[PDB]
Amino acid sequence: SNAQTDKIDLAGSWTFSTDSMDWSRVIELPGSMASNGFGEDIAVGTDWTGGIVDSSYFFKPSYAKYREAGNIKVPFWLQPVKYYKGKAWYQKEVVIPDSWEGKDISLFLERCHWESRLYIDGKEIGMQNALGAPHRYDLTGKLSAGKHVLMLCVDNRVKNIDPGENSHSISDHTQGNWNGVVGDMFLEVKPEVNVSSVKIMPERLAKKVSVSASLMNRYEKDANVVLEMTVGNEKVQQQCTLKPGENQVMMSLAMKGDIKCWDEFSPSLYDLKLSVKDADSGETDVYAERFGFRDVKVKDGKLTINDRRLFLRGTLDCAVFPKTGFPPTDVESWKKIYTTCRQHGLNHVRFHSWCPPEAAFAAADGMGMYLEIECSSWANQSTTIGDGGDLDRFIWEESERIVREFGNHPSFCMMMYGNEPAGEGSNAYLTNFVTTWKERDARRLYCSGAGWPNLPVNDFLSDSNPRIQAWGQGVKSIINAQAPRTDYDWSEYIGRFQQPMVSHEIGQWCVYPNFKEMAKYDGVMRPRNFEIFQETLAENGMAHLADSFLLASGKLQALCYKADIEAALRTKDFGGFQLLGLSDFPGQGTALVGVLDAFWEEKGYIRPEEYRRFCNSTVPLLRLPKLIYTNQETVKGSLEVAHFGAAPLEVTSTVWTLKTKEGKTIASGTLAHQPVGIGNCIPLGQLEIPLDKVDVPSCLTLEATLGDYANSWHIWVYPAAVADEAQLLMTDRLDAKALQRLQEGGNVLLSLRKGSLPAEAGGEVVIGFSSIFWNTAWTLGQAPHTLGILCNPAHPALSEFPTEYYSDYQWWDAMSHSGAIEVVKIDKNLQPIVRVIDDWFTNRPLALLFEVKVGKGKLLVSGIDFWQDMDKRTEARQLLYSLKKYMCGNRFNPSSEVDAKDLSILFSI
Ligand SMILES: O=C(CO)[C@@H](O)[C@@H](O)[C@H](O)CO
Ligand SMILES: [Cl-]
Ligand SMILES: [Cl-]
């Protein structure tokens, strides 16, 4: 029966108009125009908000069917149901009680997009233009008792202030340039002496709580007030005199008992109550907020929380919410995201060029997540920062709004201006920005911007260099250019700095689109891009491979993230990393770089428990120089641990096992070591495993268990050391000797020299071992163009080559010494022995191995070069042996007949 009589909830039906003349429709708030079905239909000439790097949609004939009216499908991001970028008017009648007359009145709008102007009965009151903070209007003396008509004019266009066309606060890459009001919307009444805002400053070691409160005195004379502050059983009361207007009082509170600190492993929170009581009127205004005791500091060039060494395992949030476009303002929505993040072993979230609503901070407070917030800007491409533009003052005002609203949350641990800044005066601007904030508020750590610039005044550094795949690196990266290994780290680069460093947007490994998730898009955003990819896949006769492409490419994607994350954990005294990402990025051409979809939900190729094995607060790490051995070699490696738990791990023993796929233990041992303290690169022991007893070509799993934490790695062991040119002819060209053998009915193995495959037959496909980087649209075709392999292990051609249906490290040699053959240009019904998964933008049937029948003879075609450096390629010799034993065997009968001249497309002069 209790009610909130001091507020008037404004959520409901508003009279709507896009020209302030036609008021024939009604809109529902909270919500956008798009979430209400209002706006214009998506057309080719839609004035989007964000860059489009690959413009093939507008010009190439393959997108012609998607440029016609009635079938507009856009490939570069999720497509909203409607679009509108301009002024919109919202109107609603309210009834102000008599008891509100002459009192403190204010309007609260949690999220507008973008600029809002308030009118009371046609009289303009003021303007608000916050992107990542609420809109507030002081209505004291401006709103009398009785019926009144509130009107809002919300403008979502980019005008004087361009924060960056790709900023996730406005851009159609993720959140979309919506128009409306979202979140809590209410009128609030307060006594003539009230609390406007509170800055909470807990002192962990001093056992104190300091508060700088902004008090309001609506009287025209001085006011005698009583100020009571309560934190649990501790109370401090204070009587002072308030001058007319705003007042800045500062109070302290001593904590008698022990203080429970806030961190990843124990997110303890305290309740603060601050009340002000006017002595004349007896009216009391009460303010309440949660807070936590924690100190995130840089001690001796290393990140610490509460004097404990800290390591950040983070992922990005780019305001992706396809159900609504605009962000959710409930705690449960964010509780889900933080929960699945922690389920994958993460403790950190970076918000890319936008600030989330209050619920994201409150959820992270109880979860113990470390948040890094940015000020709604990616000042590049379209604009610039630090050159005297209107953006310069906006970022200052936006950061002050963000710290005033959310600065008391313990999860607010780091802050930057935004992402990847541009501007000749941006270094100077960001230097003043970081320096001033470090002086204003020491409750958090500050960095200039994400990715760059490294300023000496930064608390920590954000750098993109310490990662596997750099922009433009392509096939020259470690994962692609060198044989598999797990003994590399970034310790050399980060050793050049006296500041802690956090990786910037690591991973970016792609998966094939998951068409099953298309049913989840029942809201504002529709996956029309997925509809294009799915249609072209079917047009190339591969509609039945959609789920296999998802699972096979996802197994390879998860392998790449494991490699990137373990490389960061092997870097001594690394500050941390920020994944891009755990979830998908639906924009910038379609950057499917996550093991979770745009809804932070699972896809089905890696379980969070398996992700948590290599990405966790305590992770065993194995350093091996290679992963391909013979029965005459000895596995020589080292075992270490990256332990960043709440306390040292009281374990003096590590147990390792080398087991087969069936579970049989080939080797095992126990490593003795001292108790594990907080840090990484902590040695556990050395491994020296002879492999003479390993029979047959085998894939072995090396698992290491430290206490409750276990991690595993794969190695492949082959024999140390089926051919007679009469029976099997292997050649690089279909010459006279090869064509004669096929006329005679013999068997021929065609192995193409690497680089000899002409562009017509698939030479244009730059094949590599890793997954695609970001996406070939945004990168304008950076290598690789492939997404792993797809094969049937039960195929007799692979009987001597251990493998699953998906790509793994033993396939690095195949992907690195080959070209992908476009088999449709030979015969459209050709079934590959080992298929290559092509980029989803092209959906070309690709193959590394296939077989055809040329007359009476049988031909096995291989895009893999089985010629060069075969003494160093142990895994290539094994695959070649498996093929030769198959061809000389009983079950080599190619059914697809083809002519000799049809195969001439594999050669050029
Ligand atoms: O450099 C990067 C990495 O953030 C790209 O986002 C840009 O180069 C875009 O291609 C600019 O359009
Ligand atoms: Cl031979
Ligand atoms: Cl054909």
**How many angstroms separate the CA atoms of 650 and 710, rounded?**
16
Pick the closest to residue 349 from 327, 319, 305, 317 (CA basis).
317
Beta strands in 101-217 (DSSP E): 104-113, 115-120, 123-128, 135-138, 146-155, 180-190, 193-203, 208-217
Tell me the ligand closest to 884's alpha carbon.
2
Question: Is residue 506 within 8 Å of 468, Cβ to Cβ?
Answer: yes
Rg of the chain's alpha carbons, rounded to an integer? 32
Which ranges constitute the DSSP H helices of 779-842? 812-816
Q: Which residue has the tokens 């001091």?
A: 6
| DSSP character string of 641-669 | EEE-SSS-B---EEEEEEE-TT--EEEEE
Closest approach atom of ligand 1 to CA 451? 4
Nearest CA owner, ligand 1 atom 6 = 778
Alpha-carbon distance of 306 to 575, in angstroms, equals: 16
Is there an atom of ligand 1 within 6 Å of 505 CB?
no
* Closest C-alpha residue for ligand 1 atom 1: 471
For the Cβ of 54 lying below 6 angstroms from any atom of ligand 1, the answer is no
Q: Please work out whether the CB of residue 53 comes within 6 Å of at least one atom of ligand 1.
A: yes
**How far apart (Å, rounded) are the C-alpha atoms in residues 34 and 156?**
13
Instruction: Count CB atoms within 10 A of the CB of residue 701.
Output: 15
Ligand showing the shortest atom-to-Cα distance for residue 472? 1
Q: Which domains does the chain have, with CATH numbers?
A: 7-188 (2.60.120.260), 193-282 (2.60.40.10), 299-613 (3.20.20.80), 618-626+632-718 (2.60.40.10), 728-906 (no CATH)
Which residue's CA lies nearest to atom 2 of ligand 1?
471
**Which atom of ligand 1 is least distant from the CA of 53?**
12
Note residues around ion ligand 3 (Cβ under 5 angstroms).
827-828
Q: Which ligand is nearest to the CA of 589?
A: 1
From atom 3 of ligand 1, which residue's Cα is the shortest distance away? 471
Choose among 362, 341, 349, 364: nearest CA to 319. Answer: 349
- Starting from the CA of residue 173, give the closest ligand: 1
Contact 51 CB / ligand 1 (< 6 Å): yes
Which are the contacts of 871, defined by CB distance < 8 A and separation ≥ 6? none
Cα-to-centroid distance, 763 and ligand 1 (Å): 27
Span from the CA of 574 to the centroid of ligand 1 (angstroms)? 26
3-state SS record for 45-67? CCCCCCCCCCCHHHHCHHHHHHC
Q: What is the DSSP letter of 424?
A: T
Cα distances from 655 to residues 147, 650, 684, 713, in angstroms, run 76, 15, 10, 14
Residue 827 Cα to ligand 3 midpoint, Å, equals: 4
Positive or negative torsion for Cα 798, 803, 807, 808: negative
User: For residue 744, is it left (φ>0), alpha (ψ between -120 and 50) or beta?
Assistant: alpha
Ligand nearest to the CA of 883: 2
Phi, psi of 386 (to 5 degrees): 90, 5
- At residue 673, the 3 state secondary structure works out as coil
Collapsing DSSP to helix, strand or coil, 583 comes out as strand
Q: Which of 9, 19, 31 is nearest to 87 (CA)?
A: 19
Whose CA is closest to 681, among 499, 461, 490, 467?
A: 490
Cα-to-centroid distance, 749 and ligand 2 (Å): 9
Q: Looking at 723-842, which runs of residues are DSSP E strands?
A: 728-731, 747-751, 786-791, 821-822, 834-838
Report the 10 Å Cβ neighbour count for 82. Answer: 17
Ligand nearest to the CA of 887: 2
Other Cβ atoms less than 10 A from the Cβ of 536: the count is 16
Pairing between β-strand 821-822 and β-strand 846-854 as defined by DSSP bridges: antiparallel
Would the CB of 265 count as within 6 Å of ligand 1? no
Q: Establish whether residue 381 lines the binding site of ligand 1, counting it when its CB lies within 6 angstroms of any ligand atom.
A: yes
Span from the CA of 545 to the centroid of ligand 3 (angstroms): 20
Nearest to 593 by CA among 316, 360, 305: 316
Name the residue of 173, 318, 420 to mutate for ligand 1: max ligand atoms within 8 A of Cβ: 420
* Helix axes of 331-343 and 358-367: crossing angle, nearest 10 degrees: 40
Atom of ligand 1 at shortest distance to CA of 778?
10
Mutate to test the pocket of ligand 1, among 167, 471, 588, 593 (most ligand atoms within 8 A of CB): 471
Distance 399 CA to ligand 2 centre (A): 71
CA dist 855 and 900 (Å) reads 9
Whether residue 471 has its Cβ less than 6 Å from ligand 1: yes
CA distance 72 to 44: 7
Cis peptide before 894 (omega within 30 of 0): no
For ligand 3, the distance from its centroid to the CA atom of residue 860, given in whole angstroms, is 18
Residue 96: strand pairing partners: 146
739 CA from centroid of ligand 3 (Å): 21
Q: What are phi and psi of 902, to 5 degrees?
A: -65, -25
Which tokens belong to 77? Answer: 């991001």
User: Which of 331, 287, 117, 113 shows the shortest CA–CA distance to 188?
Assistant: 287
Which atom of ligand 1 has the smallest separation from the CA of 420? 4
Resolution (Å units): 3.0
Helices (H) and strands (E) in the chain, counts: 13, 47
Retrieve residue 461's tokens: 């550094």
420 within ligand 1 shell (Cβ under 6 A): yes
233 by Cβ neighbours in 10 Å (0-12 / 13-18 / 19+) ranks as exposed
Q: SS3 for 231-286, per residue?
A: ECCEEEEEEEEECCEEEEEEEEEECCCCCCECCCCCCCCEEEEEEEEECCCCCEEE
